[model samples]
Target: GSIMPPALQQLLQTLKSPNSPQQQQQVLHILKSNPQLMAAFIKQRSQQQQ
Candidate 1:
């Protein structure tokens, strides 16, 4: 019972290990930052560079 994108879940599922007593977690809200949006932003800045 969880809420996460299927594609994102599939990829993140590999970054886990069911060994030892250690844990790590992260939650990326897509609306907060998307790849295409970030990429376009970078391009805009680069276009103004010398």
Candidate 2:
């Protein structure tokens, strides 16, 4: 029933597990600062990054 992007779900799992808050904080900051980049990666495969 969840309606979220898989990439973002994976990101959240890491934050919930043994992953450190420092790393999680960095990710949150980056996502907030450059949401477009996260959206790109979240919605599509890294075809251009290859």
Candidate 3:
């Protein structure tokens, strides 16, 4: 299995944090800078649900 990169881990952690718009925006910004992270994040989440 592959490990998550630190940047992606940080983004996911921020996204999962309590309802904070600023944190959410930070995640959005990260994703915006590296859109590939979205696909990677979704794939990981999908696997978790299985």
Clashing residue pairs in all predictions, respectively, total: 0, 0, 0
Across 1-50, the per-residue lDDT of candidate 3 in tens digits comes to 55323345545566677433433344444543554644554444436552
Q: After superposition, how far is residue 2 of candidate 3 from its true place, in Å?
A: 22
Report the C-alpha lDDT of model 2 over 1-50, residue by residue, as the tens digit: 43322334445666467544432344434443444535643334334653
The Cα RMSD of model 3 versus the native structure comes to 7.4
Sort by TM-score, best first.
2, 3, 1
**Between candidates 1 and 3, which one is better according to TM-score?**
3
**lDDT for each candidate structure:** 0.35, 0.44, 0.47
lDDT of 2 at 6: 32
What clash count does candidate 1 reach? 0
The per-residue C-alpha lDDT of model 2 at residue 50 equals 38
- Model 3: how far residue 47 lies from native, Å: 12
Runs of candidate 3 with Cα error greater than 4 angstroms are 1-5, 10-25, 37-39, 42-50
TM accuracy, model 2: 0.24
User: Runs in model 1 with CA error above 4 Å?
Assistant: 1-5, 17-50
| Candidate 3 overall lDDT versus native | 0.47
> What's the TM-score of each model vs. the native?
0.20, 0.24, 0.23
